[PDB]
Amino acid sequence: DTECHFCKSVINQAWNTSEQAMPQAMHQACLRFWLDRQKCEQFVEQHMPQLLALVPRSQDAHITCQALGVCEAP
Amino acid sequence: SDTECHFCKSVINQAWNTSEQAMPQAMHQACLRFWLDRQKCEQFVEQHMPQLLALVPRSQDAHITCQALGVCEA
Amino acid sequence: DTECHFCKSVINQAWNTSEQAMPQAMHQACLRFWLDRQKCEQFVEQHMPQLLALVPRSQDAHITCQALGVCE
Amino acid sequence: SDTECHFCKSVINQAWNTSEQAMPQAMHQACLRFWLDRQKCEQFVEQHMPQLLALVPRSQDAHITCQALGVCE
């Protein structure tokens, strides 16, 4: 298998793990707040679609590996 | 207002920290799915580790990211 | 002199150019909507700071060049 | 009337296409800033152009970018 193949598989798994861990990670971050715990958690929930869109999708693995210089090499 | 901005930066910073810490394990898991090419996959990761770890934004990016989400006006 | 220096300077200049060009580019994109040109331009106006925030800042040059493999 | 999501995706894709088209000249001009080794800078740009151009998102990324801005569900 090529290096491009390795790069996409490795990055795809990193993004998949990041996407699934992000809700819990952001929820826990709100625990650092006192009088403002609930407002923080409501913020996280209300903006969850936006926040989760911060992780690239599997379709982006190739162009990301191109940026690293390993996919679709001349 | 700035408290929403405060929430956004804190939750996003935590997600990025969690993602960065998990990335080596995640990429390792991706190479274990290979049989004859486990070693080749792991070699790719080792040679490109500084680049791959650079795929997670740094805390300095929390404010502008939250500006893109529409919560940290300026 | 270092490749890292070249990479950071060159990418930052591209981002500055992109940031400078983005308002006109988005205005032209609204021309593709027929009968809803003003609604599209109204969207652009309402979300301009967010859209402009999509261009990375100079502070991101180093980590971007690190991903490209030229800055440690 | 058409959706805000449709405006957002078209507007961002247009911006990215403009950036991608302008990037080669912009980076070439950026090397003029180096007065001791301009040719070395231009060599870096040329050698790494495929990587540099890949920093512009592709049209397939319009939806998720507009989702991050909060306009596409």
Q: Quick one: C8 exposed, middle or buried, by C-beta within 10 A (0-12, 13-18, 19+)?
A: buried
Q: Answer yes or no: do C69 and B50 touch at CB < 8 A.
A: yes
Cα B64 to chain centroid distance, Å, stands at 16
Helix (H) or strand (E) holding C46: helix C37-52
Q: Is residue B74 a part of any domain in this protein?
A: no
Return the partners of chain C (3 or more C-beta pairs < 8 Å): A, B, D
Nearest residue on chain D to A51, judged by CA atoms?
Answer: D68
H-type alpha helices, A1-74: 3-30, 37-46, 48-52, 61-67
Question: Do A69 and A26 contact (CB within 8 A), yes or no?
Answer: no
Using CA atoms, how far apart are residues B61 and B12, in angstroms rounded to an integer? Answer: 9
Q: Which residues of B touch C63 (CB under 8 A)?
A: 54, 57-58
Using CA atoms, how far apart are residues C51 and D11, in angstroms rounded to an integer? Answer: 9
- Among A48, C60, A49, CA closest to D72: A49
Q: Which residues of B touch C53 (CB under 8 A)?
A: 64-65, 67-68
D32 C-beta neighbours (distance < 10 Å), count: 11
Q: Which residues of A touch C69 (CB under 8 A)?
A: 68-69
Domain that holds residue A12: 3-67
Resolution of the coordinates in A?
Answer: 1.9
Q: Which residues of A touch B34 (CB under 8 A)?
A: 1
Q: Which two tokens stand for residue B33?
A: 């799915």
Q: Is residue C72 a part of any domain in this protein?
A: no
Q: Is residue B73 a part of any domain in this protein?
A: no
Chain A residues within 8 angstroms (CB to CB) of chain C: 67-69
Using CA atoms, how far apart are residues B11 and C61, in angstroms rounded to an integer? Answer: 24
Phi and psi dihedrals of B72, rounded to 5? -110, 75
Phi and psi dihedrals of D69, rounded to 5? -70, -10
D15 C-beta neighbours (distance < 10 Å), count: 27
Using CA atoms, how far apart are residues B38 and B32, in angstroms rounded to an integer? Answer: 6
Q: Is residue D73 a part of any domain in this protein?
A: no
Q: Answer yes or no: do C59 and B61 touch at CB < 8 A.
A: yes
Q: Is residue A15 a part of any domain in this protein?
A: yes
CB pairs under 8 A between A and B: 111
Q: Is residue A37 a part of any domain in this protein?
A: yes
What is the number of domains present in chain C? Answer: 1
- Among D22, D65, C2, D47, CA closest to A59: D65
User: What is the DSSP secondary structure assignment for residue C60, as one 8-state letter?
Assistant: G
A2 C-beta neighbours (distance < 10 Å), count: 12
Q: Is residue C33 a part of any domain in this protein?
A: yes
| Side-chain-facing half-sphere of C67: CA atoms under 13 Å | 23
Q: Answer yes or no: do D64 and A74 touch at CB < 8 A.
A: no
Q: Which of D12, D14, D72 to mutate to test the interface with C (most CBs of C within 10 A)?
A: D14
Question: Do B55 and A42 contact (CB within 8 A), yes or no?
Answer: no
Q: Is residue A30 a part of any domain in this protein?
A: yes
